[PDB]
């Protein structure tokens, strides 16, 4: 994912990017949405406005990390893409990592609605106008956002770190598995079992 | 490039029921928001209401309430702005133009072709 | 129910000149209007959206400012294809009005 040279955004705030294959974690939750260009700066840990408020608000202890990369070549198409909507209205902020879908008509006066939009009471979401020509910062962007959790139980995923060569008959320092030392290592005739 | 082909000229009586279509020119529906302009004979634009065709809600203009009814076909890809009760006034051009699944921001750009509606007798 | 009216009622002015077109709104509309070009006999075409952002295709001598209660459409080069009825269109809350209209016409 680092050495890439595709992500336009590939920064994050918990951990270091060097040290992330050094951690065994648990399991990595993944969460993934396509946005404008000039709230990708929100997505990430702390901030406040229309999509970090009401759409996906993310915790300030945030040991995670975010990704973002233009795709202005699959998601925008002639005549727009009416396709990637988002909810502007709410009754009250949102908790961090809280989901919401309900598409019942946000009530902005103190009047009944009764199911139908009218005066003072707007439809909750929004639709994304994504024209193939458009300026930098109202391309769409995908991001996906991870997150590391240090759960009681032991661990899931671990990290490929690396795998070396072994040179025999010298005395050399070693690690198995864990199982570290100093010696010299020869072929033997042993008849280990299986486990 | 979205079309919006639109019905042909129908003249009728006062009293009688029109219904006018805005069948969507590429198959089936989308985040729309069709909503629904009159323009009386030389004069400016009137509004009169907007429906959601995959979500399901349309309402009318206030001065419209109990005379106007949207009503949408996702199968097909056709709203229909179905009004009863036509008046001597009521003759103009009717108009059908998308404007974004919301409420306000973006505005109306996509327009269909007009269907001129003369009520006599 | 908010009402827009725009001023003035013809604005005659020759080609190559400078238009000024006013939609003098009654409430708080901050920054939520539409302008809309229709030629006679055709359908009308949305032209500046948000008081600020220019529809795809429309060319750039289309300029549209303002903001609150008083907003402001402003045209550099008067193209013989320029000559219309302007609308602006409110859309700040149910109903979503619309204006007077003002048509431009050739000054000789």
């Known amino acids: 994912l680092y050495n890439s040279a595709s992500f336009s955004t590939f920064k994050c705030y918990g951990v270091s990017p060097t040290k992330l294959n050094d951690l065994c974690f648990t399991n990595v939750y993944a969460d993934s949405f396509v946005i404008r260009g000039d709230e990708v700066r929100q997505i990430a840990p702390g901030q406040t406005g229309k999509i970090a408020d009401y759409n996906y608000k993310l915790p300030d202890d945030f040991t995670g990390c975010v990704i973002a990369w233009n795709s202005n070549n699959l998601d925008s198409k002639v005549g727009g893409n009416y396709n990637y909507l988002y909810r502007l209205f709410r009754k009250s902020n949102l908790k961090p990592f809280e989901r919401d879908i309900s598409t019942e008509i946000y009530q902005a006066g103190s009047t009944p609605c009764n199911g139908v939009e009218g005066f003072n009471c707007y439809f909750p979401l929004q639709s994304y106008g994504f024209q193939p020509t458009n300026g930098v910062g109202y391309q769409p962007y995908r991001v996906v956002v991870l997150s590391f959790e240090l759960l009681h139980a032991p661990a899931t995923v671990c990290g490929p770190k690396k795998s070396t060569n072994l040179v025999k008959n010298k005395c050399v320092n070693f690690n198995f598995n864990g199982l570290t030392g100093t010696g010299v290592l020869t072929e033997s005739n042993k008849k280990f079992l299986p486990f | 490039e979205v079309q919006l082909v639109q019905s042909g000229a129908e003249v009728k009586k006062p009293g009688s029921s029109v219904k006018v279509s805005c069948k969507a020119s590429?198959?089936?529906?989308?985040?729309?928001?069709i909503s629904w302009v009159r323009q009386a004979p030389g004069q400016g634009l009137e509004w009169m209401g907007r429906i959601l065709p995959t979500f399901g809600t349309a309402n009318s203009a206030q001065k419209f309430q109990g005379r106007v009814t949207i009503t949408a076909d996702e199968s097909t890809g056709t709203a229909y702005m179905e009004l009863r009760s036509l008046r001597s006034e009521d003759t103009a051009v009717y108009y059908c133009?998308?404007?974004?699944?919301?409420?306000?921001?973006?505005?109306?750009?996509?327009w269909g072709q007009g269907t001129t509606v003369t009520v006599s007798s | 129910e908010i009402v827009l009216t725009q001023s003035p009622g013809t604005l005659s002015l020759s080609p190559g000149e400078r238009a000024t077109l006013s939609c003098r709104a009654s409430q708080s509309v901050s920054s939520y209007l539409a302008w809309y070009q229709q030629k006679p006999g055709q359908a009308p075409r949305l032209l500046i959206y948000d008081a600020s952002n220019r529809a795809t295709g429309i060319p750039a001598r289309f300029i549209g400012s303002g903001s609150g209660t008083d907003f402001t459409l402003t045209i550099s080069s008067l193209e013989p294809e320029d000559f219309a009825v302007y609308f602006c269109?409110?859309?700040?809350?149910?109903?979503?009005?619309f204006g007077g209209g003002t048509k431009v016409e050739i000054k000789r």
């Open positions: 590429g198959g089936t529906f989308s985040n729309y928001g």
């Open positions: 133009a998308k404007e974004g699944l919301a409420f306000l921001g973006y505005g109306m750009d996509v």
């Open positions: 269109q409110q859309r700040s809350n149910w109903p979503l009005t």
